[PDB]
Write a protein that binds this ligand. Structure first.
Ligand SMILES: CCCCCCCCCCCCCCCC(=O)O
Length: 193
């Protein structure tokens, strides 16, 4: 799924606890042309266009999320695994109208477990930008209006081998809102060119 030979995403979620509520969730394949989502991130040029150019291309993914905004502590939990012992640097950049408004950098050392290495980045506090954005968003009286606002909101996650600075995974995230009857959903795509 979302991964390479060196590093795979095992689980991703963002949630609020007052039993808890997942806005989005991935627990653990088509293609999309990165071309069409440059405007959605900064031309840093450390932004998407620049990163996809250094490579490698098989490390790049796009995820479309249909978030459940129908519901505290706001948290993000991430888990990766690999067969090699590594220390990871995880960069998350929140962008609004192609401009970066948050960058969060975290480090996680491998933990030996059941014949492989796991990397657990759990219950990291969600940035306040997002908490405040979510409280506004859930106020909109129509889902079509939430989707219009979310057209301009994206996240770019870059996971690097800290000791070698090699890119392991780069994931672009885009968002719409789901209904309550249908839960959160996602679709994972390969980014190509
Ligand atoms: C409109 C739905 C979005 C709400 C859920 C956001 C899920 C992605 C959050 C992870 C990237 C941000 C960096 C980690 C902590 C943070 O939130 O600052």
């Amino acid at each position: 799924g979302l991964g390479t030979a060196r590093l795979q995403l095992v689980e991703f979620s963002a949630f609020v606890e007052p039993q808890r509520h997942l806005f989005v969730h991935i627990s653990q394949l088509e293609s999309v042309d990165v071309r069409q989502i440059y405007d959605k991130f900064p031309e840093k040029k450390g932004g998407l266009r620049e990163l996809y150019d250094r490579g490698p291309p098989h490390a790049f993914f796009l995820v479309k999320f249909w978030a459940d905004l129908n519901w505290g502590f706001y948290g993000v939990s991430s888990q990766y695994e690999s067969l090699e012992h590594m220390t990871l640097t995880c960069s998350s950049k929140v962008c609004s109208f192609g401009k970066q408004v948050v960058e969060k950098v975290e480090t996680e050392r491998a933990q030996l477990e059941d014949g492989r290495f796991v990397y657990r980045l759990l219950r990291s506090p969600m940035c306040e930008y997002l908490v405040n954005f979510l409280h506004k968003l859930r106020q909109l009286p129509e889902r079509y209006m939430m989707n219009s606002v979310l057209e301009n909101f994206t996240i770019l996650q870059v996971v690097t081998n800290r000791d070698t600075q090699e890119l392991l995974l780069c994931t672009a995230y885009v968002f719409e809102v789901s209904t309550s009857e249908r839960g959160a959903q996602h679709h994972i795509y390969r980014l190509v060119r």
